[PDB]
Amino acid sequence: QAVTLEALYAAIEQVLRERLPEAQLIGFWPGVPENTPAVSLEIAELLPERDPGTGESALLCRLQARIMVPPGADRQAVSIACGIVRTLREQTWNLSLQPARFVRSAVDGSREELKSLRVWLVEWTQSLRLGDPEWAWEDQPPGSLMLGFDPQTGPGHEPDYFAP
Amino acid sequence: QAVTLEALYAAIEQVLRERLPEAQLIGFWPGVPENTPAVSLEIAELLPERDPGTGESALLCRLQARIMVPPGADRQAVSIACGIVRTLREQTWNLSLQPARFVRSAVDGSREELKSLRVWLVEWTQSLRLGDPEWAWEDQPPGSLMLGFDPQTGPGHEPDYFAP
């Protein structure tokens, strides 16, 4: 039903490894610039939005991508950046989300180490309903059923329940 | 049909070598300030735009030009800059594009090396339809034809096809 950040972090890694085979290594919090065409996702800032009428928290996250590359492969790193921007026009990442809004792409100066001198910030925002809904007050478990009563249940009561 | 960044990088190099013979060396990602009247194209920032109703990604790229020159040839470097600005009033670069919008031209302070002290940033924006269209779902290859069928084709089926 509703989304989670851990389900969101895996699916952005999932699609970008499928659509981009030239990207050798996709991860949501990597390090260690071991080779040339590396892509390091990040998180910049998560901002509020118009709160819907249930217990959902509306959040737009600046999903930040940093394309680290050693100098001399400047043209080869914009072609990595052009693959991400052409994805983000309609992409909902197969997660019942809104399509992501592309924001910018430019050369920046990182605070981090500059062995890979040229870095390209790619940030985009998409809305999230992370708060648990109040439309339904229960869950849907499959299996066999056990029925108990008021002053006889809890975790310390195994033989109270019945299953005819 | 549609444009590509690699077709765009060659055509900006192509026209500027034709119209500007005083520019000794035009390149889209050069280095090595080997002599006085050098021109180094760059990329500053690519920004979104109003998305059309197909699978195109609307992008305006700040195509940045940096005119590196040693000091003592200050007047000789504005005359290089005046040749680029007079080009950009109507220029579509023969690529089915919109005319480029001139933005600014001024002396800046680079992060790079300052053997060539005086640099002139020349940036301009032009829109791009880089996303592949959905108006046609096929291509136009010329040659002889081969026809196959449903459970018998793919790359591992050479003798299935026919050509009468």
Binding site: - | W137, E138, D139, Q140, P141, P142, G143, S144, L145, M146, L147, G148, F149, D150, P151, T153, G154, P155, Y161, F162, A163, P164
Partner: protein
């Protein structure tokens, strides 16, 4: 299912079942393939392979131009389009082969196209799942 008619159709054998034998019963051919276990699919694949392959005598080498592919394929899609609204094919697509049309094979001068189509299957088992609920019982109030 205990009848000796359904015990004969499961050996891929058509039967004659009614009282004093007044209809056929069975669509199965004697195939070991699950795809070709239908006399409709075998009859329609062999009739559109014979239509397309024995209908391209004009497409011999006579100045193959850029407009040769637009004349074969749009005369090939329009034949399969006539099959769809006739009711012969549920869904079709005449598409160029994506995994075979390479740049190294374009220099050979031999491009590849694929003609796929989904044949109309006979409704040999029309299941009905009828249930009695109590959902609309509150509709009896006014």
């Amino acid at each position: 299912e205990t009848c000796r008619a359904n015990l004969l159709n499961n050996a891929n054998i058509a039967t004659i079942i009614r009282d004093d034998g007044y209809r056929l019963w069975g669509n199965r051919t004697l195939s070991s393939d699950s795809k070709w276990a239908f006399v409709t699919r075998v009859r329609t694949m062999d009739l559109v392979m014979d239509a397309i392959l024995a209908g391209h005598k004009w497409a011999v080498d006579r100045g193959i131009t850029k407009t040769y592919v637009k004349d074969v394929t749009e005369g090939l899609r329009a034949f399969m389009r006539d099959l769809k609204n006739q009711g012969a094919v549920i869904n079709f697509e005449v598409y160029a082969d994506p995994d075979l049309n390479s740049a190294s094979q374009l220099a050979q001068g031999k491009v590849y196209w694929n003609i796929r189509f989904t044949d109309v299957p006979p409704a040999e088992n029309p299941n009905f799942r009828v249930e009695v609920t109590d959902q609309w019982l509150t509709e009896v109030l006014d």
